[PDB]
């Protein structure tokens, strides 16, 4: 995916790589406008250029970065919620300093986003990359995530996509606790220091309780899943910007929620303790009773969350979250469209075509990172 | 040419693949108007959403199709007609039911388009795919064309491109002539049924006699081509939706009517029947007397095409007919750009950059259907 | 880069591939107004019409041209001149007939663009290719470079770049003279004839003396370079037409100008001498004394260039030429986006996009020329 990844950096973005890609995003921006601001346009552009003659780069105002979270939102062509981009709450952590700090605005958005259930989209952006030595970054993939655990005699327990993540944690000195729905610590890397590791309290974490509407007995072998999906290790490009640490949430789909994950010892066993039910010939491949068991969990997550009123984005919550975004638009007094944030960057030896402002992929941290 | 292909399904397409798409479209639509209707365009928005919501799919309207079989057409980079879209008649058959009921409205289009050799742009749209079990379409490649036969020394009779096909039709039950110009029959497949072979009435498949301003013995080689160029098997991809049957015509361009194709044992024998002119020298390569009768056969048959009065795309016709294109926008009292048609796809593992509304290829139905 | 090389025709360029293409820069080029020009806005795509129907081409306003090479500087991703795009003087020489004519046309913007060190930009556009049997080519890469020998021990002498470019002047008749800093001739060729060798008057090229601020023996070692950096070899593609000669140039970066070039025995050298300075210790391979001179030698360029008053884009001009870019376009009672000049080309196989106008790639004269 190097198409999509930008990398690490050890020397600021060069003045004709800069320069460019801000003035670009400051016209993208100003376009914006149903009423043009022709003086405060030429004005912001002089701004910028000035600025980062005098000082190597720039700083965007508060409404520009809010406008640049929502476009790259609007530019996330797997991202269903790409249809109600307005419906983001931008939080400004630019002048944090610490990883004690990045974890109090980290645990701001838990709360804010959670909200017992009724879930809202949000961003945390944290400081910009200066030099590309003093980096904010979240060294998870996701704000909440399951521990995953290499037993002895080969199985895993957890979260199988966790596996390196949580040794690392080990490594940092976080205690494991063996279990199947451990939520893992968050490891904190600010101002490209090393990373400081933060358990996360509890009370932030919603969870929600597996059950089936007809079948009593599923409660029984204890399945959960956290509410909140929020990735955490992505990077935000802007104008030739880029922030390395901004995480944000949406919330579940309802088909995907991972565990159902058909894959090796993990699954065969939740699928038999299934047949225990309606279709119990679990002793023979004639009855393809894993499609019926597969069905029903789905039917026991989508149950459990609808009746536990945690969000999930459904055929009503679709529309109903793509009105409330036009009720913004509409209030205000036609959309820019998406050909606008098409670039053409000539990388080495080809003329390819980038989307901007845009979330883009990043390099494990600890894969790159210098130890102190 | 698989990045160019939209294959087969089998179950209706997802939620969060269908509506941001109907959404871009429904944006596009709307904002092609001079004057703009905020009003219709926001409950229309609405209406679609909540009938996706609803139904799992939408309609268009029949003026939103119109636009959209137009916009694919000037999304056709390989298409000279692109440069007069809106002289294209469309006919709505979405209420089709049969391959009998197929078979009229493809008849319609035939005698509409080809209107004695005046020859006009038409196209018939069927039903929109629905689950993917329950297509129409046109096995046939082109509505009107020669069949191929494979003779048993080993040579071929006909149109060396549609062996494969005839060989089919053969299978399907209709009698083979063994001649040079024997017009297919219409495989027409309807509602994922198994397709219905049907001759086409030869009162409705216009000739055009091939002969030479100069050389009288011309016309006694017996050479003639069909006047309408239809393509059969394409699909038209709009806001989501997908079209697997909706053929549509054009008309020659001269430099390109295929037989003069300089093949195999097929070119070889018209080509020096052709020599007992000026160059009669066939009996060495000494003298390039190919050339001579290549350049001389185009001769032939755009004079031939002319005289018969059968529209073909000469440069008198490709400016009388873009001006006939103009005529029709003044009359309306600027053009939307082309990059408002570009939509970023993520497919797997890749961004790149789609248009739409698009005429795709398909795969050819036998290689993929279902036998009742 | 064969994606970026457009490269000889042997006839013209046919009418589908040329009418959709002349359209498409004609409503851009009309686009541009605030104000709109509808009367003439259709008048003009019909006059290119009838004119491509009659004369088989078409010839642009000098004010269409204007605005193709600076579309084109705008569409040129590598180039942090396109920030400043409407800061280009245009020099139509597209009545030229001789390179005897060329050159003067050279000579005029080599005289304009230098300026005595106050840089100006500046393209010579040469008459369009017709049927690719008659162009006009600079077989030069730059109008003004050094000479590259190849020393019978081996070692090259001058620019290694351009060893199989200086080997062809001097078999075409040019004197080598073997030094340093020996200024290539120019080889014109004009309507496809061959080509004709002038050398350039030396008081026309400006040349840049390297000396340090601090180390006054840096002008002994006798380094010098020249102030005008202007590409000779490009194609200007604009609405189909070809423009093969539209030689341009801008002014250099300070960070690039090429000898400092760290490669063989030709750095080695002069990087030795160097450390006569305050890193004495040349012995050795354990002090990266390379690194001190390196970082010193583009020390002695940039003062060398601000110093003797020539143009470099320094953080403060690339500030002042954008803000004089900016100016231009205030005085003219919002920008036309990149995006309305992506053009999707059909090439064999696949979809692809493009820019246009465009400067593109070429193939090496000498390479494809047919000797008279
Ligand atoms: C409003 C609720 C949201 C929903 C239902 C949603 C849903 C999705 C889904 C289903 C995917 C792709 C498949 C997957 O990775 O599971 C995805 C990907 C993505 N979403 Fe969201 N999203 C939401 C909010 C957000 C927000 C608020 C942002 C950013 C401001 C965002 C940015 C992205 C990005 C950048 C990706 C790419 C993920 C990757 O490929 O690694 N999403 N989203
Ligand atoms: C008005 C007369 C028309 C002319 C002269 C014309 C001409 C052409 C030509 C010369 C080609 C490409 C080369 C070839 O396949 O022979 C082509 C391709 C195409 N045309 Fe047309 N066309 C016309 C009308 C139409 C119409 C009415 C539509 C659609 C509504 C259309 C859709 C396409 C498409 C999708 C292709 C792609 C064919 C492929 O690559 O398989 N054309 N057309
Ligand atoms: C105003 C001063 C200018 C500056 C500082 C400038 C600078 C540059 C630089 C730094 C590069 C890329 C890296 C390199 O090849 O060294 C470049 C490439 C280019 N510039 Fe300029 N440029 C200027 C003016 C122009 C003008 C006036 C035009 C055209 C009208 C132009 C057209 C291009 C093109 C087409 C390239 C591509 C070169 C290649 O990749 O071979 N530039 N320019």
Request: contains cysteine.
């Amino acid at each position: 995916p190097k198409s999509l990844t930008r990398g690490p950096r050890d020397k600021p973005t060069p003045l004709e790589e800069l320069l460019p890609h801000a003035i670009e995003f400051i016209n993208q921006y100003y376009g914006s406008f149903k009423e043009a601001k022709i003086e405060e346009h030429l004005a912001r552009l002089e701004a910028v250029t000035k600025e980062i003659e005098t000082t190597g780069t720039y700083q965007l105002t508060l409404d520009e970065l809010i406008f640049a979270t929502k476009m790259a939102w609007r530019n996330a062509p797997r991202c269903i919620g790409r249809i109600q981009w307005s419906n983001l709450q931008v939080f400004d952590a630019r002048n944090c300093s610490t990883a004690q700090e990045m974890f109090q605005h980290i645990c701001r958005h838990i709360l804010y986003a959670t909200n017992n259930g009724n879930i809202r989209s949000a961003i945390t952006v944290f400081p910009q990359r200066s030099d590309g030595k003093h980096d904010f970054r979240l060294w998870n993939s996701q704000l909440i995530r399951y521990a995953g655990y290499q037993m002895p005699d080969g199985t895993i327990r957890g979260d199988a996509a966790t596996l390196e993540f949580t040794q690392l944690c080990i490594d940092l000195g976080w205690k494991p606790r063996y279990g199947r729905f451990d939520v893992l610590p968050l490891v904190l890397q600010a101002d490209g220091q090393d990373p400081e590791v933060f358990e996360i309290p509890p009370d932030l974490v919603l969870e929600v309780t597996m059950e089936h509407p007809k079948y009593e007995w599923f409660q029984e072998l204890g399945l959960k899943w956290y509410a909140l999906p929020a990735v955490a290790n992505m990077l935000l490009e802007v104008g030739g910007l880029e922030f390395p640490a901004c995480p944000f949430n949406g919330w579940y789909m309802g088909t995907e929620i991972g565990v159902r994950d058909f894959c090796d010892t993990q699954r065969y066993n939740i699928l038999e303790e299934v047949g225990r039910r309606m279709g119990l010939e679990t002793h023979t491949l004639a009855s393809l009773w894993k499609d019926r068991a597969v069905t029903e969990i789905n039917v026991a997550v989508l149950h459990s969350f609808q009746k536990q009123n945690v969000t999930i984005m459904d055929h009503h919550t679709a529309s109903e979250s793509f009105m409330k975004h036009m009720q913004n638009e509409y209030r205000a007094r036609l959309v820019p469209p998406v050909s606008g944030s098409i670039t053409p960057v000539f990388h080495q030896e080809m003329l390819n075509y980038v989307l901007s402002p845009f979330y883009y992929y990043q390099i494990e941290p600890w894969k790159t990172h210098i130890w102190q």
